[PDB]
RNA sequence: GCCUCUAAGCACAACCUGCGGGAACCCGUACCGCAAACCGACACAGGUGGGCGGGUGCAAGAGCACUCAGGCGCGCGGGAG
RNA sequence: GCGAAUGCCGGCAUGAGUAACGAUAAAGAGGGUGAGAAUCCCUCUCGCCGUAAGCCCAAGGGUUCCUACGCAAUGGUCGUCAGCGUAGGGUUAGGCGGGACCUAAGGUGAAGCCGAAAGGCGUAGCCGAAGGGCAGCCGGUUAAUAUUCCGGCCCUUCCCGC
RNA sequence: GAGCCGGUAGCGGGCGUGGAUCCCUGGAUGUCCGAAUGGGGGAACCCGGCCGGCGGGAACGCCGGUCACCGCGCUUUUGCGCGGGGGGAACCUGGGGAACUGAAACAUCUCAGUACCCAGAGGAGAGGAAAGAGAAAUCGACUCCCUGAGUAGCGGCGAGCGAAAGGGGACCAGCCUAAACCGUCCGGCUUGUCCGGGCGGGGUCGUGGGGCCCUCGGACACCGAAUCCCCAGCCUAGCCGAAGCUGUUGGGAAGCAGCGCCAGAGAGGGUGAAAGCCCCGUAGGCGAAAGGUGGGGGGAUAGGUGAGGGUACCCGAGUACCCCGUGGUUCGUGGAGCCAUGGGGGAAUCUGGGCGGACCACCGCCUAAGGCUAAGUACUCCGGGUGACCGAUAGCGCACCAGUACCGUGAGGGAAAGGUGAAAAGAACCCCGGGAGGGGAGUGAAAUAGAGCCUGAAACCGUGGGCUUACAAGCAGUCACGGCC
């Protein structure tokens, strides 16, 4: 309740690029509005936040033998900086 | 340890608040390490989970028991 | 509910016959109606003091809206 | 044989069983009393991964099943399982009381 | 939306208008899709809403014939006849 | 306690290795890959479309789409190919669309009228649509998405100030 | 009481006798939908107005607290302070209310006041102190079981339908309230002297109450929870708890054999094949807690009941009663009463007034036109126990990721699928193959117990062997004989 806590980085491959100039590519409470967003992030990182875009996704196809379900549902969404800074050691990494 | 039990007992205030707050922010800290260490980390997520959730309890003790 | 009656209650039911007699005049009546109906009163109003009405149904009625008439 | 057990990591022996000569036993379940008596199992004759030798096989095998493993050996091994007269202030230590006797002692031995 | 007056404030902090500074969230987008991905229990020759329909030839033009692009050669073959 | 009730349930034979392999728009050759390829991959001959077997919006469908491996089940045999199996990765928009607005049919319904009760009816107000209204478009950029990403040029509304 | 981070074991990390896993009672937010209720909306999603906060501040965007509708009575002012609603398998009451079918037609009738739609209380509702029953100067609430009769009787007296009082039994209390009359009274009208609404006395049990005069007259009765504290029953956790070892064919022994034993507990199951004494916290028995529920016994709180005559009458119902249209009744049209109302007439205050006997004269009965409640029959969701009840095509269709796969537009329909072994010891590794899968080694008591792998039998399909067959007519066969083996 009031965790400010929201996300999981987006490590995948294309978010790549992003976190090598500007735009850091992460996962988001499937919820948190684009002002949270920028909330989460600037608050959390002492960044710039600049440009807060997101797309949500469902997963599909995971089969249990007689039977079978799908997955929940991965929330995407992707910030930029405003000179570089912040996420560094993350990037650095992923 | 039920000795955290205790320092949970206590805190109060801002104080409660500020330092579930701050803990909570170490747990996304773990989250993110999901994909690093992640060996003795394990506990060090379902256990700071679990504190933070006293330290939640508490402050419902606290005030709730005041008002 | 929206015509019970207002000074008590006269809303509802029967299943009414029909024949043709000669009982006790010359032999057996004659009997073949399996038929149902309705069967009720009636509706009217006057004043508090300048704004009224009634609503009501017929004999409990009027000497009722009397009763008011008393107060 | 439920929620309820007998003899702990503890010591004892095999009645009607394949070895009788009883010792330190490995662990107990709790309701499903399968217990371990490192006393005979095999060697699976292992994946053949280097999780064993990458040239490899299983090495100690001992899920002790049949429940015919004559709890507790005091200095009298074939006994059952006493409780208390308390004599002392909150005294539970069912110990085991049974002509010899042994109640796993904190000291000297587990 | 333009104007037009009440509440009523406005009227000294309302609307019109500048420039600068600053903000602007929620759900959608992949691909099928005149169709083996949609409607027929099937990779069913049935059906299914709007959008020039490239060129040439013919009186006329989305009819016609070859074709532009771009799309196929149908999902069992061989073989005599 | 039952052949036997065109009986019930399940197997299981039977024409029978015959009937067909879903449109008369045609294929044929050459290398490549594989464990094996008429049936997969490139290349070269040929034919069928084209005003459709066009490209696009939407509808509906929703996994799939890509990428790597993979076939024993599935494609009416084929198959090392898939729209098939496992995994991983994949659609972001102040200016596109829909709602943050408008109204219709019609529905709901504070009032009101009215039914044995379940209701019927119903002003206004509200819901209600590629009908109204509303601020961008073009070039580039991935395996994949793009008037959203990037760049170029042009706007929009609402907030603080002056 | 010493092991566990759920069905998942596996990886990769752990926690605990300085009462860990778990068992119960109480906790805490407890996403969003759903009576939904702040608004809207194809539910499980988008919108908003107020105080709070934070952030880049305002615009924005979260958490928070907030803010439908209702009828309900109260400060009728400005209205703040309570309730309902939405459920629930069968059970219950009232509203409404059906064809088949029977009558071998089918119209009164039967199926029935049944099925079904509904509202509503519950945990049970239902009914519930007599205008009752009943003819002996007699019983005495209601409910339910047996009986009363399938008689009394109802009826195209046709098919059929079909009481009650009394007896036996279970269960056993009764209290109220307008009832002007009192007075108190405050509000009234208009004022003296009617009506209104609060407190009484009365507050009708089997009848009176009251008002006026004298006998009065000075302590036992608790509910329909009065109500309160108790042993409080359980809820789930409890724990003890009798006596055997050797041998022995055996992969097994609990069995065959030797001796010893238990017992107010030879109820069952589990232990590798059939134990009273191996395991089971069972009957043997005892056990148990400060939470959540009272019948008991007890107290107290005890609201509230509880006397005598007399005297002009004032004092429980707007509808009784009558006539027509009907319901209920064993009453179907009737000599048909009583109760219940739709309709029009339209009284009475205990000499009142209905009830038995259509009705009349009698006698006898009860006291209506308001109110409240225990207990004894109901029902099965859910718990526990039991079966000359089932064993996986019967059981609930459901034995286990069956109300779901899947058909349907939806309402709706509604499958199949259980077992290797004692325990994983379930298959290293060598061999053909792309693979499966096949042959070896180890499993082993078995693997023709091998992974849908127990028992796995019929149809049907295959490899091998004996006999038999190309001038043969016959569902079938089967009596004889002979060749074959």
């Given at each position: 309740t009031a965790y400010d806590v929201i996300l999981a980085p987006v490590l995948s491959e294309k978010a790549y690029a992003g976190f090598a100039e500007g735009k850091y590519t992460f996962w988001v409470?499937?919820?948190?509005?684009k002002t949270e967003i920028k909330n989460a992030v600037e608050t959390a990182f002492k960044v710039k936040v600049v440009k807060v875009n997101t797309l949500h996704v469902r997963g599909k196809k995971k089969r249990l033998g007689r039977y079978l379900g799908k997955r929940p549902d991965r929330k995407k969404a992707i910030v930029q900086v405003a000179p570089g800074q912040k996420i560094e050691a993350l990037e650095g990494l992923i | 340890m039920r000795k955290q039990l205790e320092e949970a007992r206590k805190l109060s205030p801002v104080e409660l608040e500020k330092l579930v707050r701050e803990k909570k922010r170490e747990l996304m800290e773990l989250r993110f390490q999901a994909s690093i260490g992640q060996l003795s980390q394990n506990h060090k997520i379902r256990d700071l989970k679990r504190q933070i959730a006293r330290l939640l309890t508490v402050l419902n003790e606290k005030r709730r028991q005041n008002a | 509910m929206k015509e019970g009656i207002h000074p008590k209650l006269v809303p509802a039911r029967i299943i009414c016959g029909c024949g043709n007699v000669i009982e006790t005049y010359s032999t057996k009546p004659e009997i073949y109606v399996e038929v149902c109906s309705k069967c009720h009163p009636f509706y009217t109003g006057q004043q508090r003091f300048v704004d009224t009405e009634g609503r009501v149904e017929r004999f409990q009625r009027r000497y009722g809206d009397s009763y008011r008439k008393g107060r | 044989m439920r929620v309820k057990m007998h003899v702990k990591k503890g010591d004892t022996v095999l009645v009607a069983?394949?070895?009788?000569?009883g010792r330190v036993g490995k662990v107990k379940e709790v309701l499903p009393k399968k217990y371990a008596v490192i006393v005979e199992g095999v060697n699976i004759?292992?994946?053949?991964?280097?999780?064993?030798?990458?040239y490899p096989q299983g090495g100690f095998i001992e899920k002790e099943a049949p429940?015919?493993?004559?709890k507790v050996r005091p200095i009298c091994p074939a006994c059952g399982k006493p409780t208390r007269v308390?004599?002392?202030?909150?005294?539970?230590?069912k110990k085991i009381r049974v002509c010899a006797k042994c109640g796993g002692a904190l000291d000297t031995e587990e």
């Open positions: 409470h499937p919820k948190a509005t | - | - | 069983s394949g070895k009788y000569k004759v292992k994946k053949a991964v280097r999780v064993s030798p990458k429940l015919h493993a004559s308390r004599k002392k202030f909150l005294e539970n230590g």
